[PDB]
Design a protein around this ligand. Structure first.
Ligand SMILES: CN1CCN(C(=O)Nc2ccccc2)CC1
Ligand SMILES: [Zn+2]
Ligand SMILES: [Zn+2]
Ligand SMILES: [Zn+2]
Length: 461
């Protein structure tokens, strides 16, 4: 139970308009053979070109929706569409390119996949809504064989060059012409009634249908993401480290402690309502406040209605208007005015944030989290939280070459007294780096309108 058996049955109804007369009884073994590929019984890490839903979810960073539309089947040109928005036209002789032979088209496919995937994944997973032409066109740009390594590094081989007879990963494939050992999954195999557009539109209004192959490719990957990350969630799946995951997560913990500690000192709320992660611990353990936790799992479809988070059935709910409410990555439609909020901005461009369903995004950092679309109106009762650094720690060095720190946002006893000490200057610079790391990763901070750092200076007396 690791790979998809080649002898698994493949439902062929979706393929019969492009391939009339196709047998209803069909295996992956026979389908692959029909596509022009010879597996010759090989136990070398590539048992099937097709993979299970579970293997696809483990490799979501590799997903590339692919669709082929028969413009005019050997004698006709084909429109090759990708979920990157690219449309290529291959002639047998929203970025739309004119008709070119396969020998040049395949060089473009390798360039595009390599640039899109080199910082995301060790492979490609073609996400299909298979009708026939996409499967039969694969032989014109795909080569298969045993698992291999790059000619220039230790990464697995994803590309092949006929000019040099060598193999490369996504980082070293410049000038390569063939996709090597790609994987693929047919979304139609999951049991769907009706066509791609009708199933996609049930959950998403952001992707339209301009009737080009890239629109179908985008809709296909969108629908796959809804099925695997929106309606079905698995937070037990671990994903590899591809970027600043560790620094971002450490920054988030530093920022949360800083902001919450400062809010409690400036406004002295008697009670804090910590709403979100059922596994959460107190971010400011030494604070005076009555800390009360409320469980809400990360919402992956629509943002929580604030009224449902306070809904208590036949009993009285806790008083949310007393003290402060802390929503650390707990996505609601409209935050109460007495809130401290961290909300991920789904629009952020990064290697951790993949395009999602209905304006939302799939943020992949250790775990995959489909996040609802960022909506500025959720924050109408609050203001953006400005950067500040606060510290009550003693002015002592212990144990880097100096330029004295001058900043109005270094809230320390030394700055109050006229001159920032070396320890607080080092800590301020580290904290500003962590803050910038967290912000550039996509997180946004919001706070109740009465929040004022001027109230922190009198904590030094
Ligand atoms: C039966 N329970 C009663 C308690 N309950 C709430 O009090 N929710 C809540 C959440 C955050 C702040 C204040 C109240 C949910 C339903
Ligand atoms: Zn390489
Ligand atoms: Zn969509
Ligand atoms: Zn100091």
């Amino acid at each position: 139970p690791t790979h998809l058996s080649v002898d698994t049955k493949f439902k062929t109804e979706g393929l019969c308009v492009d391939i009339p007369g196709i047998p209803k009884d069909m295996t992956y073994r026979r389908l692959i053979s029909m596509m022009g590929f010879k597996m010759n019984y090989q136990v070398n890490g590539y048992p099937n070109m097709f993979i299970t839903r579970e293997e696809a979810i483990r490799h979501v960073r590799a997903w590339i929706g692919f669709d082929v539309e028969g413009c005019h089947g050997t004698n006709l040109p084909l429109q090759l569409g990708f979920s990157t928005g690219v449309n290529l036209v291959a002639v047998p002789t929203p970025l739309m390119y004119k008709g070119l032979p396969w020998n040049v088209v395949r060089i473009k496919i390798v360039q595009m996949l390599s640039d899109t995937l080199k910082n995301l994944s060790d492979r490609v997973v073609f996400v299909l809504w298979a009708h026939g032409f996409e499967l039969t066109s694969m032989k014109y740009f795909v080569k298969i064989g045993p698992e291999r390594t790059c000619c220039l590094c230790d990464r697995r081989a994803t590309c092949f060059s006929t000019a040099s007879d060598t193999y490369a990963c996504w980082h070293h494939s410049i000038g390569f012409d063939y996709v090597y050992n790609p994987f693929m999954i047919d979304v139609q195999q999951w049991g769907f009634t009706g066509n791609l557009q009708s199933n996609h539109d049930l959950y998403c209004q952001v992707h339209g249908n301009a009737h080009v192959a890239s629109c179908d490719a985008i809709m296909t990957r969108c629908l796959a993401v809804h099925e695997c990350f929106v309606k079905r969630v698995d937070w037990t799946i671990e994903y590899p480290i591809i970027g600043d995951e560790l620094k971002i997560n450490a920054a988030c913990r530093k920022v949360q402690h800083m902001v919450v500690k400062a809010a409690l000192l400036a406004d002295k709320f008697p009670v804090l309502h910590d709403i979100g992660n059922p596994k959460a611990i107190k971010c400011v353990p030494q604070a005076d406040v009555e800390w009360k936790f409320y469980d809400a799992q990360p919402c992956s479809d629509k943002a929580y209605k604030i009224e449902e988070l306070f809904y208590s059935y036949a009993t009285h709910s806790d008083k949310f208007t007393d003290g402060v409410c802390l929503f650390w990555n707990c996505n609601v439609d409209r935050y109460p005015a007495n809130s401290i909020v961290c909300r991920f901005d789904t629009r952020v461009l990064s290697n951790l944030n993949l395009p999602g369903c209905d304006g939302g995004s799939l943020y992949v950092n250790k775990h995959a989290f489909h996040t609802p679309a960022f909506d500025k109106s959720a924050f109408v009762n609050l203001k953006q939280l400005p950067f500040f650094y606060y510290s009550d720690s003693p002015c002592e060095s212990h144990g880097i070459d100096y330029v004295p720190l001058k900043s109005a946002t270094c809230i320390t006893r030394c700055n109050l007294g006229g001159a920032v000490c070396r320890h607080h200057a080092n800590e301020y610079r580290l904290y500003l780096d962590a803050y910038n790391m967290m912000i550039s990763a996509g997180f946004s901070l919001w706070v109740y309108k009465q929040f004022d750092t001027y109230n922190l200076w009198n904590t030094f007396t």
